[PDB]
Write a protein that binds this ligand. Structure first.
Ligand code: TFF
Ligand code: CL
Ligand code: CL
Ligand code: CL
Ligand code: MG
Ligand code: MG
Ligand code: NA
Ligand code: NA
Length: 326
DNA sequence: CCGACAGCGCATCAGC
DNA sequence: GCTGATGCGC
DNA sequence: GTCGG
């Protein structure tokens, strides 16, 4: 919050380059800067001072000047004023609709929530459900509720097979007081890097979670990744709880640490860590951390028996989950 | 300057 | 059907 | 849009 104005401006800038300009790198550039300025322990006094931070170059510097001065950014004003742009920014806020679909729709004349509705016949399933809970999905999830959703989940998993270990990651594992959604990492001893002794392992948990009306809809579902909606039940007369997005990732029980590190993020932290890994001569994904021999190709899995071991490989002092919020 | 910029699962399409 | 690209998402 | 070689 210390530099909220600047970061927000950088965030609006990043959402625009991504949603309208479809310039994925400019989107990321603005995000890094926003992230770097976010954790800066001083109330930035100038664009020249912000530049003293990696990720902030001349361009953002100028804009920070234009912002600190007037109290806003002209480039943005003209963007908030355009219609197609603001309209494309809005449709992307629907789950399943990215910059492409957005622009298309907006070309076809569809440009508002009302338009999306009278045109439901024009959305695939995912976009369909995305519109169904457009509102609900915009709301935060109080941690106290994350705690209740967890119990339903850990307890419905333990009911299918006591050998399943379900871990809530994302912002929750990072100690956040509120979360955007529930991210559940799942592991069963019947599925390792060596073999899938049991199929439907993920389908089993999804079914059981649907059997008890926790999972309400599916956005997409694979052999190892489920994407959907769930709802904490309410007590008598109680108004219903918002509908929430839930993702369940099944990872080989022997690659759990690379998986938990992955699913705890943050996304930018995962980006900076995975980016540093390269500079150090490693490549990190959600399964393992391998080397990058001469040719440049990835070697074989390096032994990992704890999250920290991964931080070690790349010469990085360990960082608590609560400190990976970038 | 200039090329890298993290890494991958599911849906869906093109082309075969 | 298959694979590779592309969209969208985590 | 920024940065490292
Ligand atoms: C986006 C994304 C996710 N993840 C991994 C690392 C991420 O930590 C993890 C969760 O992904 P989400 O549920 O998409 C998330 F980002 F929203 P969150 O971190 O849970 C969150 F706190 F922002 P909230 O949802 O609002 O509570 O997946 C990545 O590695 N890269 C990505 O681009
Ligand atoms: Cl770009
Ligand atoms: Cl691992
Ligand atoms: Cl791998
Ligand atoms: Mg999440
Ligand atoms: Mg999620
Ligand atoms: Na800088
Ligand atoms: Na979207």
């Amino acid at each position: 919050t210390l530099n909220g104005g600047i970061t927000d401006m950088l965030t609006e800038l990043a959402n625009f380059e991504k949603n309208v300009s479809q310039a994925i790198h400019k989107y990321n550039a603005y995000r890094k800067a926003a992230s770097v300025i976010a954790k800066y322990p001083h109330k930035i006094k100038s664009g020249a001072e912000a530049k003293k931070l990696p990720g902030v170059g001349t361009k953002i510097a100028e804009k920070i000047d234009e912002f600190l001065a007037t109290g806003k950014l002209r480039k943005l004003e003209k963007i908030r004023q355009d219609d197609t742009s603001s309209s494309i920014n809005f449709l992307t806020r629907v789950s399943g609709i990215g910059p492409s679909a957005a622009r298309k729709f907006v070309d076809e004349g569809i440009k508002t929530l009302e338009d999306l509705r009278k045109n439901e016949d024009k959305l695939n399933h995912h976009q369909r459900i995305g519109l169904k809970y457009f509102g609900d999905f915009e709301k935060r999830i109080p941690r106290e509720e994350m705690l209740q959703m967890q119990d339903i989940v850990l307890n419905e998993v333990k009911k299918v097979d006591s050998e399943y270990i379900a871990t809530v990651c994302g912002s929750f594992r990072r100690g956040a007081e509120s979360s955007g959604d529930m991210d559940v990492l799942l592991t069963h001893p019947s599925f390792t890097s060596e073999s899938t002794k049991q199929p439907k392992l993920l389908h089993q948990v999804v079914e059981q979670l649907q059997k008890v009306h926790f999972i309400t809809d599916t956005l997409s579902k694979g052999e190892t990744k489920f994407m959907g909606v769930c709802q904490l039940p309410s007590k008598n007369d109680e108004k219903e709880y918002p509908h929430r997005r839930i993702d369940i990732r099944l990872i080989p029980k022997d690659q759990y640490y690379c998986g938990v590190l992955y699913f705890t993020g943050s996304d930018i932290f995962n980006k900076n860590m995975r980016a540093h890994a390269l500079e150090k001569g490693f490549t990190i994904n959600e399964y393992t951390i391998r080397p990058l021999g001469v040719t440049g190709v990835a070697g074989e899995p390096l032994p990992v028996d704890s999250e920290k071991d991964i931080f070690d490989y790349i010469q990085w002092k360990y960082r608590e989950p609560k400190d990976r919020s970038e």
